[PDB]
Design a protein around this ligand. Sequence first.
Ligand SMILES: O=[N+]([O-])c1ccc2nn[nH]c2c1
Length: 300
Amino acid sequence: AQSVDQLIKARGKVYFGVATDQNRLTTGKNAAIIQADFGMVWPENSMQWDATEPSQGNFNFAGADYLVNWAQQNGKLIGGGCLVWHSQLPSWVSSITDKNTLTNVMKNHITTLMTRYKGKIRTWDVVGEAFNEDGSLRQTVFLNVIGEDYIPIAFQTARAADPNAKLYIMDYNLDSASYPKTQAIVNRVKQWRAAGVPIDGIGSQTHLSAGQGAGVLQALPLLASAGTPEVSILMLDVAGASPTDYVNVVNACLNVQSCVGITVMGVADPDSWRASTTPLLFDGNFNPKPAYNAIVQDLQ
Ligand SMILES: O=[N+]([O-])c1ccc2nn[nH]c2c1
């Protein structure tokens, strides 16, 4: 019944974290497990663009406010995001075709969310899923209308709104060192940072199939070679939840000096987006699964 967050702090890392929101914190044993075992919380949905600005200039913070207040009262660090992510856009954003108009909408969205929680958020995921699988930039509304400067603009705008935040770019399928996407994000982040773009971290959205944990041992050092101050594992779940896959991911974290922590996608299996693959660390009784105990043994 040991706390993985307490144990990973003992190994010199910052946090073992989890995604949650108001609808989980108010039912079952989610809050008790988060209180005991995790040191950082993220809003699964309540800070996404469609949740917070469902119509232009009309903001909804009730869910995000609840999460931030709960975390502060319970001694937890807070991550927020995603500020710019095409798959969470409300419909009104995608029909804007003017560069100046979309730039202003994007900056206003960033600045409004970050100002409301200024000083309270350790990490912001500023841009997500900006890359195609071949390493090219994904042709989203932001790329199509603003161009590739939208990423520099988003990060500079975020730094100005809350300079004490750690600003991350995140993506998925960065789990293999030989995959073109993994190399591409490293090379682009190096170029952006040399030009003064304030990218503090790369966050790897780590949705794994069985047996893919071993690859992260080589991919994570490659991500860290971009020279960002931090890297992190985000949104972690593993089909089958095998102890071997989870332990390999934890050990990749421990092996990479700049990796500050790990965030898992959720608490209990039935609430996973792929519950049929039983991919989390607690079962539907809110009891720890073998993978949880394997992490504990590994961290000791
Ligand atoms: O790590 N996460 O579980 C997580 C969840 C939702 C997010 N939105 N932006 N970044 C996120 C990270």
